[PDB]
Each structure stands twice: as structure tokens, then as C-alpha cells.
Amino acid sequence: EPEKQRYTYWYAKEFTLRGNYWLYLEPTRWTQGNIAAATRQLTEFLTKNRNIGESVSNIIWLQPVDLPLLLDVELDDDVGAQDVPGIFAAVYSTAEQYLMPGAQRYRTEVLQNAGMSNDQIFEGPLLEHGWIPELPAARDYTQRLTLNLSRLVNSLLEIEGIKHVNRLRLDDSFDKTAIEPVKGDTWSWSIKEGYYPRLWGEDPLNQLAQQNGPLRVIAKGGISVSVSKEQIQASLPSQSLIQNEPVILAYGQHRDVG
């Protein structure tokens, strides 16, 4: 927690409590629908993980800011017309995992296929859902946070039908919380103290499908085709909820050695 308000108490003179922290919660799109359900589950969890001399004092919830993100995609020459809903799902997914730092979880046996040992998999705490060997390296929420998007273009250049991007800007939707572009570069923006990016709220039906152009696809010079909401969700990668059962050695055949 900040050092200025650290449970300072009189009754005699000034005495500050050493050892209680605060946490900043960046909730997802689901739990911002139901804040009260996530509140009762986290308050159950922090008593089970309460350590020896430390406790939570203050819980901070975060507030979304829609980050409009004009970007003009130009498509390749030899794409199919039916592969274009595959494009809209792809340019959405690689835009989320860079702007919104999402932790990647996957099964234990996938890690056993990889080269790292059994000491490396079970390193952290017991995770019932997936394993997180790499962290997303979340930035601190004590200060305001810059978001550099010059790294984005190769993550956007990666996908098969995409040959290049033509624009990367925002249409004056940053003034509500005074997001200032840092010193000279056009790509970076610094969101003010409490907020976190929500780049396209209610994403496909509100923004991507309506042909208002938050994302303009250009295909074969100028034909500029678009898509509806439900067509890209079928070509969207659907995640799988995975639960990790405990590892045991099963019995062999009992032999009458007695």
C-alpha cells in the first residue's frame, strides 16, 4: 500500500501498522456484468490464503475506457471471399492479447510434451485450471500507464491474409479521461491513474460488424468487404475450460505374499 496511509493510529502518539497491503483488481468483461458475484468469491479466497503477518486492507476495482483504435487493414490478393470472417476474428484476437495482458493457461500433458521438466511445471501454487509458466508481466497500478502500439504491427502483419495495415489512430475518444500522447511518438498513449483499456466494448455487434469503420478491411484494391457479428464467432477460436485432476500412482495387482 502507499506509505502515507498505512493504518496509522493514535491511542498514545503516532503508531503506524507495518504489514498490510492493497490490491488492484482489473476485472474482465464477464465480471463487470456481475460485480457482486465476483466480490463474494474473492472474499472467500483471501481468508484461505491469508499469510502470517499480512492482510488486505483496501480492494480497488478498475473502470473501463473504450479505446477506439482506428486501424485500416489491407488484405492480400489471393484470399477467398469465405476466409474474410476468418480475418475479422483473427485481427480481433491478436489485438486483445497485446493490449489486454491475458494469462495463457494450458494442460499439464502439453507441458510434458515440451522440453521442460516436472520441476518447472508445478513451480507456483496449485492451479486447478491450467498452468501459467510465463506471466503477462502486468504493469503497476500505482502510476498511470503508457500503452505502446509500435510493437502491434508485426502481430497484425502475422496473419495469412493480412499484407499490411494503413492506419493506427484514435478518433477523439481519449479526452474523457485526458489520455495524453507521450512526447513525440504517435503510437503511445497514457491512460490516467485508475482506468484500463476496453478497446471495443461489446465488440462485434457494437463496432466490428456494423460497417461504421472502427476497422476498415481493404481487399483487392478497393472492394472493402465486411461481415456480420455471428459469422466470425464460428471462425473464432473457442477456448476450453480445463480442470487439473490430482496425480496418483494407481495400484498394481495385489499378490498373496503373506
Binding site: D78, G80, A81, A219, K220, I223, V225
Partner: protein, 135 residues
């Protein structure tokens, strides 16, 4: 011409026997059917080779959908209840007509030119005959 694999089996299995005299005849004679159509696709596609590699192409039609058994045969009489349904799923070959556009890209490559890229204003039925007469 295709001669059935159910002919070459020993006659005690009953494939050339009179139909449904014993009850074990029919589940056996449906077991030889999927391994017959896989071999009947191989006999069509060699007979399609003057059609598959001609320069004056005119067809949607690729690998093949013909029934393996002649119409008088006893092997036809076993599956006569679902021969109209099996021939119609054999007409999935029209859905595989994108492959025919990959051979025209190969046959045009003899003369140094690739095929045209696929556009959005195709009218893909009328697009293709332009690509056929080009070859």
C-alpha cells in the same frame, strides 16, 4: 471396368449366394460395401485421366461418383433399399470442384501463365467457364 472384391471371396461366405437365405448374409454384405467404394474410386479416376488432363475442359465433375456394382448383379440387390441415398451422398463430388480450379492453374503453367486470382464479383459459375476457355 470394375470387378467386385465380393466376387473373389470363397463361396461359403455366401456373397454370390441367393439373397437373405441365411441371416448372416446381410451384415457381411454391408461390411464389404465401404471397402468396395474406396476401391471403386480408384478405378474411376484412372478412367477419368483423359478427362482430367484434357486441355479442352468443360466440367465441374472430378474424382467420381459411380456405383461399383452393375445393375443386374446380386451385390446390387443387397443394398437396393439405400442405393438412392448412397448415390446422392456420392454426389458430394460437385462440392470438391474447387480442386478443378487448381488443375487449370497447373495446366496453364505449361504456357508460363498462372490462373487468375479469385475476385469478389465472380459469379463463380460464370467465372469458371472463362477460366476453362482460357486454357
Amino acid at each position: 471396368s470394375y470387378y467386385p472384391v465380393s466376387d473373389t471371396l470363397p463361396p461359403c461366405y455366401g456373397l454370390q449366394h441367393s439373397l437373405s437365405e441365411s441371416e448372416h448374409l446381410l451384415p457381411l454384405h454391408q461390411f464389404m460395401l465401404p471397402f468396395e467404394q474406396l476401391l471403386a474410386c480408384g478405378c474411376q479416376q484412372i478412367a477419368m485421366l483423359p478427362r482430367l488432363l484434357a486441355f479442352q475442359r468443360e466440367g465441374y465433375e472430378v474424382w467420381g461418383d459411380q456405383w461399383p456394382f452393375k445393375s443386374g448383379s446380386v451385390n446390387d440387390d443387397a443394398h437396393q433399399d439405400y442405393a438412392p441415398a448412397l448415390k446422392d451422398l456420392l454426389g458430394q463430388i460437385a462440392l470438391d470442384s474447387d480442386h478443378e480450379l487448381d488443375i487449370i492453374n497447373y495446366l496453364l503453367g505449361y504456357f508460363g501463365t498462372q490462373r487468375a486470382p479469385r475476385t469478389f464479383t465472380t459469379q463463380l459459375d460464370d467465372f469458371r467457364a472463362v477460366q476453362q476457355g482460357y486454357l
